[PDB]
Amino acid sequence: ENILNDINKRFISLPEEDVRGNKQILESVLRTFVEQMKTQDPLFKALFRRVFYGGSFYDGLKVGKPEEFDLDILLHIPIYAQPVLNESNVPGFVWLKLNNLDGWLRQPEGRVYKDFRKKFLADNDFLDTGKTLRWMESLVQKTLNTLPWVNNATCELTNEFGTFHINWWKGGPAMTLGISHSSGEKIMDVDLVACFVFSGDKWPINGYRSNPFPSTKPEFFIVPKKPPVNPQGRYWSLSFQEQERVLIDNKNRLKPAVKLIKKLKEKTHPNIASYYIKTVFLHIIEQKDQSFWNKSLREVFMTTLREYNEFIADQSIPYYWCRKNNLIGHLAPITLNNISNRIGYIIKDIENNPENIAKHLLTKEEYTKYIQGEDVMAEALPALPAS
Ligand SMILES: [Mn+2]
Predict the structure, then answer these.
(1) Which of 368, 374, 260, 305 minimizes the C-alpha distance to 12?
(2) What is the CATH number of the domain that holds 15?
(3) Structural domain range at position 172
(4) Are 328 and 276 in contact, with CB atoms under 8 Å apart?
(5) Which of 149, 210, 258, 345 has fewest C-beta within 10 Å?
(6) Which residues make up the binding site for GTP?
(7) 12 is in an annotated binding site
(8) Measuring CA to CA, which residue among 242, 244, 195, 186 is closest to residue 94?
């Protein structure tokens, strides 16, 4: 009863000591950068509340060597300006307008918000995703220029863990910081995502699931990821990732089971996004008694794999927070039929033969190292590099 845990340790999960050490380094580099950002823009300093570290690495759900995560930079509009969040005509997306920005500007603390409308708002004082992204990109560029550069446009930052190199580029809506040890070893990429955070009173009700932790996780935020829709720039995504992280925590077999299924997905059906698997497990959490997660890893894996296949076969994975959004509604029936048939064959092949699981989860090259006793995760990303 250790086959699945052994596969996970040797071929799936970064050792937790290295997870923790890389997080301490990365979080310190980013605090230095965000503190410098505050020196470059009083409006950013006024808006800034906190950061949220987003992605599978920080959820404990990353398969293999971690490569990137999102720095969700949470900005807060003063409630005196009367922000109003409305559920949009596209399930899962919202609009945000301000009903009293002028009254806030007439307050003493509103002085630093003199350019907020110009920088962030479209017609009728709607928060605009494109304007927000352009504002953050400009601020990041301004900040990068004030840092010491070595080599060719490589920033050098120091902290209690040593000296680090920051490279940057824009491959999407948000700037990416590539963070490396000064000795050359790459650590991780970080996307700098400008978000707006709200208190529990603003939680959407029209077609949305209620907050499971309104006392201890009261806040949620909106993310400038658009769904063609009109009006352009008004549609914001909701992030309930802070609540999702609590839902998946303290559940023993759950995170190994998710990663085993994600490993299977990477090998046999990359057509399915990782968040769709995460979403299936949110539904399973809601359906199952809490004791389910204390069963054997084999039983949790086999049972959730079967239920995952039923979602795929049904061709519907409802967005956990707004059920009218089918996360796989855009995938073709033929594709989903083939993937469900694939998974059904795998279930039959491993049903009564747990020694066949590794044959389906691992590439042939990984399987050879598996049989030979190798551990490819032990040194996948040492927080203290060998140099
Ligand atoms: Mn339940």
Answers:
(1) 260
(2) 3.30.460.90
(3) 2-246
(4) yes
(5) 210
(6) 191, 237-244
(7) no
(8) 195
- The token pair at 32 is 């230095």
Between the alpha carbon of residue 249 and those of residues 47, 71, 246, 254, the distances in Å are: 30, 21, 5, 8
The residues with which 163 forms a beta bridge, in sequence order, are 158
285 is in an annotated binding site: yes
Helix, strand, coil % (nearest 5) of the chain?
A: 45, 20, 35
CA–CA dist 15, 9 (Å, integer): 7
174 close to 168: Cβ distance less than 8 angstroms: no
Residue 306's alpha-carbon distances to 59, 170, 363, in angstroms, are: 23, 40, 22
**Dihedrals φ, ψ of 65, to 5°?**
-70, 125
- Which residue is associated with the tokens 């409308």? 117
Q: What is the 320 CA–ligand 1 centroid distance (Å)?
A: 14
Residue 295, annotated as binding a ligand: no
Report CA(257)–ligand 1 centroid distance (Å): 17
156 is in an annotated binding site: no
Residue with tokens 């040194």: 379
User: Annotated binding residue at 70?
Assistant: yes
- What's the gap in Å between 293 CA and the centre of ligand 1? 11
Question: 173: how many CB neighbours lie within 10 A of its CB?
Answer: 19
Query: Which has the closest alpha carbon to 56: 334, 317, 266?
Result: 266
Q: What is the resolution of this structure in A?
A: 1.6
Q: Which of 70, 56, 68, 71 is nearest to 12 (CA)?
A: 56
Q: Judge whether 262 is annotated as a binding position.
A: yes
Tokens read off for 117:
């409308």
From the CA of 12, how far away is ligand 1's center (Å)? 27
Q: How far apart are CA 19 and CA 13, in angstroms?
A: 9
Residue where the block lists tokens 């049903």: 351
DSSP string, 183-201: TS-EEEEEEEEEEEEE-GG
Structure tokens at 322: 């707004």
